[PDB]
Amino acid sequence: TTPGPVMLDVVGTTLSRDDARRLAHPNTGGVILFARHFQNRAQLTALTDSIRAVREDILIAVDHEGGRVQRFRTDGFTVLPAMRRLGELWDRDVLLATKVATAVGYILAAELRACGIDMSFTPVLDLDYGHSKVIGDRAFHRDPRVVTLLAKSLNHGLSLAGMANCGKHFPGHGFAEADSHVALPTDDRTLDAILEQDVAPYDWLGLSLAAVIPAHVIYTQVDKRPAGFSRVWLQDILRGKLGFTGAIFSDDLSMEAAREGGTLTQAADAALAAGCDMVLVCNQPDAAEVVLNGLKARASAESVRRIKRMRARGKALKWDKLIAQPEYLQAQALLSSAL
Template sequence: MQLLMHSPLILDVAGLQLGAADRKRLRNPLVGGVVLFARNWESRGQLSALCAQIKAVRLDLLIAVDHEGGRVQRFRTDGFTALPAMRELGAYWMVDAPGAMRRAAACGFVLASELRACGVDFSFTPVLDLDWGGSSVIGDRAFHADARVVTVLAQSLMLGLARAGMAHCAKHFPGHGYVRADTHLAVAHDARTLGAILSADAAPYQWLAPGLRAVMPAHVIYPEVDALPAGFSPVWLRDVLRERIGFTGAILSDDLGMAAARAEGQSLSQAALQGLQAGCDAMLVCNQSVVHNGRPLDVLLRELDQALERGQWTPDVRSAQRRFDLLPTQPPLQWDELMVSDSYRAALDDVFNLPRPAGEK
C-alpha cells in the first residue's frame, strides 16, 4: 500500500478539531483530501488550527470546501466577507459588462485570499451551469442564462482565484441548470440530445477547456446520451469531456452521499468504484463522519482496499498528479497581513463599490 499514490478519496471530518478516528482515516493512503463544512467552523483561529492539524497528518492532503458566495458559503462570520451570489454578477453584466468582469475577478481574489489565510487550499467553484430558471438547487448560483456570459464571468472569477494562488473546479458538467430535481434528494433526468447540451450548457467547458484545472460532473442522467449519471459515465467523462472537449485536468466527483449518486442502491464503495472506472480522478464523500461515528467511511476504506487487491481498479499516476496539481504552490498572506494589503482592499472595493459603467459620467 505504500506504493499507492492515487489517493482517490476526499472525505469529511466530524468536528472543530481532528479526533483519533479522523487522523487514522486521513493517514490511509486511499485518502487524498478533506472537505470542510459549516460544522467544522467556529472561528478563524479554530479553522486555522484544524487545517494545521490536517496538514500535520499529511502535507499532500488537499483541504477543500464549497465556498461560492451567495447561499453556498460555509464560513460567514469572524471577518469572512459575505460574497454576492453569482446571479448578481450576471445581472450587473447587463448594466456594465467590463465592470462585471472586474467584479467577478475581485470576488475570486477575496474568496481565495480569505480561505488561504486560514489554511484552506481549494474551493469547489465556479458554477458553469446555465440559469434556465427552473432549478431550485442551482438557481442564483448560476451567473446567467447565456453561455457566453457564464464563460466570461467564470473566467474572470478563476483569474481572481489564481491570483491568490488557488485552483478552481468548474461544475456541474455537462450542465445541471436545465433539470428541476435536486440531485441531493432525487434522481434527475435531462432528456435533451447530446447536440443540444453541447451547444448550450456544455459550451463553457469547451471554450474554457485549455485553462480549466478541475471539473465536477453532475449526478444527472441524460438518457439520450447514456443511461448512467454523468459522474459515473465513461461516455460523458472519457468520450465527451476528455476526448471531444479535450479537458486534461482533474475530474472530481460530486458527493457520493447524494441520492442521485446511489439511486440503484449501491454502497459507497460500489459508487466510488463505478466513478473511478468511468474516469474520475477523485471521489468526494461528504457528511459520513457524523454517521455512526464514521462507520460508513471505515467500511468504504476497507472495501475499496479490497477492490484494489482484487484488481477491480488500478491506481493511476496521472490521477495522482492531477490531484497534486490542485495544491497551492505559493504561500498565502496571513490574515492580519491580508487585511492591510493594497490588493485585498482594492478587491473589496470592486466587490461592493460598483464602478460606474464605462463612458458614464
C-alpha cells in the first residue's frame, strides 16, 4: 500500500479501533502527534509501533521546533531553545552558532527517531520582523542570509540522524500581523518585495530544504487566495521559479484562516489542486475521516514520490543506546555551555 494525501491525528495515547479504520484508509498518508499523545517514552514508542503495524507506509510527524513549540518536553526529551536564541548567539559568534544549530538538530532528530517518529515540522524560515506574535521567538533572525545559514546547519544535524526537514511558513508569516490560527492574516507587499527577503531562504537552501508548509496568509498583491490554496504561490513561485521538488504539506486546515467558503473537504481539494502534496486535518479525526472519504480524485504519483522521501532514512538508535553515544553527549554538552 502507498501513502495517501491526508495527515491526521489519533484519539489518544493508545490506538483505538476508529484510529485503525482511518489509518487503513487509502487516502491516509500521515499521522501528526501533539502533546496529548505523549505520556512517556515507553508509551510513545508503543504508539508509533502500533501505527506502523496498521499502515507500514505511514509518515509520522510532530512539531518539534524548540522553545514555545515542542510537544514532548519530559521523560528525557531535551527541552530545546527557541530558534531566536540561536540568532542571538550568531550575533555574538557566527561559527559557534552554526555548530550549536547542528547539535540542536541532531539531538532533536535522534530523540524523535528513538521513539519511532519520521520527522519534525522544522525549521521556521519566517524572518524576525517583530510583526508576528504567533511566530515570535520561533524565528531564527531578521536577516534572510542568517536564517538561511542557521536553518541549513540545523537541517544538517537532522540529516546526521537520517531525518528530513520542512521549512515554514512559505512564502513568509513574519511580516503579517494576525495569527492564522484564529484570524485571516494579510500581507500587502509586492511580489518582488516578498521574493527578495522572505522567500530567499527557500531558494538559497537548495537541496538542504526537504519540504515546505505554506502559510494561511493572503498576499493581496500576488493572489487573493491564501498561499496554501494558491496555485500562484505553490506552482508558479515554489515549483516553477524556485524549482522546488520536495513535499508540500498544507498547514492545518482546521485553522480559522483555512476556512474559506465551504467544507473541510473542499478546502482539502483546493490545497491539493493548488499544489500541496499532503493536507493536514488536526484535532478532529471524525471530520478528517469525512475528508478521507470525500476527497476528489486526482493525479497523485508525483506527490507519492515526494511523500515517501520524507520517511526517516537508515537505522535509528534506541534510547538505551543513544543515551551513551559520545556524539549525543557531545551535542548535549555544547548546548549547555553555548547558551
